[PDB]
Amino acid sequence: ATLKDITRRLKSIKNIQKITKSMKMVAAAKYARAERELKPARVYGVGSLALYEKADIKTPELIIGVSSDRGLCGAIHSSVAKQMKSEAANLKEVKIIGVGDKIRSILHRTHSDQFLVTFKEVGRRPPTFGDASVIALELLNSGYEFDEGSIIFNRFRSVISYKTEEKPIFSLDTISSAESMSIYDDIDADVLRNYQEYSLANIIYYSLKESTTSEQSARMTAMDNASKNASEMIDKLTLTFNRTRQAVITKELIEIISGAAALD
Amino acid sequence: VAYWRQAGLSYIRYSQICAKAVRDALKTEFKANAMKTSGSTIKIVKV
Amino acid sequence: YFRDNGKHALIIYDDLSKQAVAYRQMSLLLRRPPGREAYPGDVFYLHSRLLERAAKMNDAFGGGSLTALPVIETQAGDVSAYIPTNVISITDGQIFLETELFYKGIRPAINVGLSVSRVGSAAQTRAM
Amino acid sequence: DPAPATTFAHLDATTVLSRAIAELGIYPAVDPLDSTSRIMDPNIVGSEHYDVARGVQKILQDYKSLQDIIAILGMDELSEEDKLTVSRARKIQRFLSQPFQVAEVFTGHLGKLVPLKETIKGFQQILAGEYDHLPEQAFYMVGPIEEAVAKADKLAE
Amino acid sequence: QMSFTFASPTQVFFNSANVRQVDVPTQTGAFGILAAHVPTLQVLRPGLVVVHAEDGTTSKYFVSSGSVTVNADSSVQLLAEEAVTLDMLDLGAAKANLEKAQSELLGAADEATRAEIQIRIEANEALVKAL
Amino acid sequence: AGVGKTVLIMELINNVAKAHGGYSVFAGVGERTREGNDLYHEMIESGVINLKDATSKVALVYGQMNEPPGARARVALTGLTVAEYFRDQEGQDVLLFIDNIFRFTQAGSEVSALLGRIPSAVGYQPTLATDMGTMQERITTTKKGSITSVQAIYVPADDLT
Numbered sequence A: 001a002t003l004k005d006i007t008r009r010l011k012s013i014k015n016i017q018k019i020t021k022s023m024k025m026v027a028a029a030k031y032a033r034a035e036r037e038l039k040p041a042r043v044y045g046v047g048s049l050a051l052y053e054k055a056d057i058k059t060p061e062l063i064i065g066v067s068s069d070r071g072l073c074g075a076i077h078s079s080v081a082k083q084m085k086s087e088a089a090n091l092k093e094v095k096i097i098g099v100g101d102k103i104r105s106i107l108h109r110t111h112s113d114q115f116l117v118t119f120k121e122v123g124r125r126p127p128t129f130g131d132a133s134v135i136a137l138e139l140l141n142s143g144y145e146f147d148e149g150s151i152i153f154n155r156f157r158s159v160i161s162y163k164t165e166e167k168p169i170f171s172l173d174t175i176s177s178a179e180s181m182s183i184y185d186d187i188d189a190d191v192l193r194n195y196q197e198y199s200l201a202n203i204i205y206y207s208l209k210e211s212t213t214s215e216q217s218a219r220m221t222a223m224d225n226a227s228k229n230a231s232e233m234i235d236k237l238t239l240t241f242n243r244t245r246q247a248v249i250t251k252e253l254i255e256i257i258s259g260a261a262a263l264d
Numbered sequence B: 001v002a003y004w005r006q007a008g009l010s011y012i013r014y015s016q017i018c019a020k021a022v023r024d025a026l027k028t029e030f031k032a033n034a035m036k037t038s039g040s041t042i043k044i045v046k047v
Numbered sequence C: 001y002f003r004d005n006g007k008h009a010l011i012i013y014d015d016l017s018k019q020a021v022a023y024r025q026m027s028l029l030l031r032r033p034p035g036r037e038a039y040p041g042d043v044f045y046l047h048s049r050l051l052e053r054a055a056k057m058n059d060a061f062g063g064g065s066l067t068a069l070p071v072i073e074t075q076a077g078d079v080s081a082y083i084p085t086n087v088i089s090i091t092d093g094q095i096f097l098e099t100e101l102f103y104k105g106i107r108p109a110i111n112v113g114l115s116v117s118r119v120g121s122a123a124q125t126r127a128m
Numbered sequence D: 001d002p003a004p005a006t007t008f009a010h011l012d013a014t015t016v017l018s019r020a021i022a023e024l025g026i027y028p029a030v031d032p033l034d035s036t037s038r039i040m041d042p043n044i045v046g047s048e049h050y051d052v053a054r055g056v057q058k059i060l061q062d063y064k065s066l067q068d069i070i071a072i073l074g075m076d077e078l079s080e081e082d083k084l085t086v087s088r089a090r091k092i093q094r095f096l097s098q099p100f101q102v103a104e105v106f107t108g109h110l111g112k113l114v115p116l117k118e119t120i121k122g123f124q125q126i127l128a129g130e131y132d133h134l135p136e137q138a139f140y141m142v143g144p145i146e147e148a149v150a151k152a153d154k155l156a157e
Numbered sequence E: 001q002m003s004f005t006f007a008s009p010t011q012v013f014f015n016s017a018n019v020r021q022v023d024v025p026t027q028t029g030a031f032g033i034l035a036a037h038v039p040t041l042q043v044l045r046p047g048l049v050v051v052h053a054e055d056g057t058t059s060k061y062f063v064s065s066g067s068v069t070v071n072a073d074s075s076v077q078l079l080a081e082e083a084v085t086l087d088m089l090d091l092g093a094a095k096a097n098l099e100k101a102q103s104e105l106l107g108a109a110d111e112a113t114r115a116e117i118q119i120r121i122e123a124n125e126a127l128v129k130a131l
Numbered sequence F: 001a002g003v004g005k006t007v008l009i010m011e012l013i014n015n016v017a018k019a020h021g022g023y024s025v026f027a028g029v030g031e032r033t034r035e036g037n038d039l040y041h042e043m044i045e046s047g048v049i050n051l052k053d054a055t056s057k058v059a060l061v062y063g064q065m066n067e068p069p070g071a072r073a074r075v076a077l078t079g080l081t082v083a084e085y086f087r088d089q090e091g092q093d094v095l096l097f098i099d100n101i102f103r104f105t106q107a108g109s110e111v112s113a114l115l116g117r118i119p120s121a122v123g124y125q126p127t128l129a130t131d132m133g134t135m136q137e138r139i140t141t142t143k144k145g146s147i148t149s150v151q152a153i154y155v156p157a158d159d160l161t
Helices: A003-036 A038-048 A076-090 A102-106 A129-140 A193-256 B011-024 B028-036 C016-029 C043-052 C082-090 C099-104 D002-010 D046-073 D080-096 D116-127 D145-155 E091-106 E111-128 F005-019 F033-046 F069-089 F101-113 F128-136
Strands: A064-066 A096-099 A115-120 A151-158 A161-165 B043-045 C008-013 C065-070 E002-007 E012-019 E021-023 E032-034 E040-044 E047-053 E057-063 E066-070 E075-080 E083-085 F023-029 F058-063 F094-099 F145-152
Touching: A003 A038, A003 A193, A038 A193, A038 E002, A038 E012, A038 E075, A064 A076, A064 A102, A064 A193, A076 A102, A076 A151, A076 A161, A076 A193, A096 A102, A096 A129, A096 A193, A102 A115, A115 A129, A129 A193, A129 B011, A151 A193, A161 A193, A193 B011, A193 D046, A193 E040, A193 E066, A193 E075, B011 B028, B011 E091, B011 E111, C016 C043, C016 C082, C043 C065, C043 C082, C043 F101, D046 D080, D046 D116, D080 D116, D080 D145, D116 D145, E002 E021, E002 E047, E012 E047, E040 E075, E057 E075, E091 E111, F005 F023, F005 F033, F005 F094, F005 F145, F023 F033, F023 F069, F023 F101, F033 F058, F058 F069, F069 F094, F069 F101, F069 F128, F069 F145, F094 F101, F101 F128
Parallel strands: A064 A096, A064 A151, A096 A115, C008 C065, E002 E075, F023 F058, F023 F094, F094 F145
Antiparallel strands: A115 B043, A151 A161, E002 E012, E021 E032, E021 E047, E040 E066, E047 E057, E057 E083, E066 E075
């Protein structure tokens, strides 16, 4: 075409290159942190599962997405989205809680009525246990409790990876009557619950913190993707550019001279 | 169910207040981190 | 004349861009070659010789000076156009002004990177 | 370039070889949606071909739109139908690719020929998604579409 | 031996460390979980944790709440909502808080509030333990 | 630019041309009077030109903008001619500063047109290479010493295409 078109191109790509990077490093910073800060959490949340581990409780009656509030700086949400609608088939009672508004976003799939609550903007200034407790607390109250389901969140895994998790979500003190419950004795539909609770909180927090971490690596990654792309793409054009540019000149010199040399 | 599970009270509800009360306790130095470590950017909707 | 009269003058050449055109026009009209970008080649020389006549003189010349502000008006940032490029290779820097800022109201509207005093920093007020 | 520009005037069927395609190692090398014959017809080519082709042409053209998009947008958040097509297009592409029948020296394969209906059908089939829950690999350097499926199987391993 | 995992969301202090005993401010009050103490699940009270670690140490702590978990397995999990070494609490604050807290109790008037103030008061007590 | 590029160069001269008994020729190609001045004092100042000592180790030859093309164009051959004198005659390993040869080149092209000749696309005299070649080939290492060429080279149009 012309260099115009090209620059018009270039312009943006370059912009992009930067933008992507802005978005990248920032993301990475958040991410870096998010991970970092994740250590006690890691333990803690890993902790959360303590006995859910050593005996899961079954609910023949608690799906709950957990994502961030934004995405498309990755298909982060799409993973949970997947995993939650997929979930929803399986389930009982499907009333869902979306922590993440990128959860709201995906969920509308009979999941505008089947939300129970939604929690929001947990990224963009991080989530916390404070939050976690919040989401935890109110969640309970609602005649929705255990209805099985999952807590579907982005479980961070490594810088380069996370795998979006889904859980069994059980809180019926009753089947946590059954089994092992006895065995590691000291139990009551109190303490049960007041762990069930607490581990709901622990997880809720945890998961959430994973989620966000996963995203932060994912935006960063998305921004990765892009910039790598960007850079080549630029690379390519710029030549072609140049060429045509030169092409001009040359041609043009032609057109001019020897196009309007003695011959015109 | 007594006063932190009141008649009701989440163990959370309680708990968080406990912990919060701990946060309230302690020194300030630490409390900078406190709320920071117990945000609740959890804005809420039902949908 | 001032320079040799130990006197310091500023000539603002407004615009030599227009000269180049005229001259090219002239060259070509003379049915005689021009040069590069169809513009006469030694128009650079032309100007070089013109502009070398702007200088900062020693004492023998009364210390006078002839300060030159040549102006070239870019068309769509096309300094690449050989002739602007020319001018650059002579100049002691070039002062890039950017419209975007201007339109932004940002006035000075300068493109900073491109605004240059090549080493014009050997005549700067300590205050500054 | 003027020359080709002229050329077109006289042409009846244009076989446009695409360096872009070629470079992907592809032999055939064609720019497909440039390689044409004016006598594109629901009549002459009959509508079956014609339409199938038009559908194809379309999808490829559409896909073409997408290249640009994915190029710059990575991929991954598109309509999944697009995702499908993209792959399909590649199958189609691949299917359009044929090994060389004389240039086993180049290919290390024999190349084939596809009786036209098996071809129309072919695309209809891919279009039919009949293959499209499969790996994309097999279609490459193929002759008749069934065999591409056959080739799929061996690859489905 | 008992593997003591001591953490708060904030920190992990011990992670299944071969501690011989941890004596816990569970809502039991305590039960001072011995390496030979039946696995048991507990919700944590606000009180102090003492980590008799098989090392000639008992380490001091206050935890607010949470749950402690005594697995069948050698591992004990203090999952402390707020977990502190007594080291970081503020005595000064406690007293001051405590008067105030009680005061508020005097003005508490929902079962819950009362609970809460009292909780708070208590909190200051459970802190006061140390403090 | 102006970073003490020249200075570095002076330093090089210093390090080498002193060290090994190399000498220097400076061809101020497309130099501003100003820049040649700059150098001038830089050398004066540095005392790598010494207008009272033969520790003026540099002959400065100037082929500046302000000249007619031919001169600037030819300043290249000229500068060479001196160094060859030093090289063969004075056995030298010469350091030859030709700075900025690019403008020389420009001059070649400038004239090309005005030699009625077609220069080429991008303006360039079509002989660009031969001009160069022939020039370069004078510059070398031989059984006579070396003419070692320190060439200021502009990234033309910041392009190279």
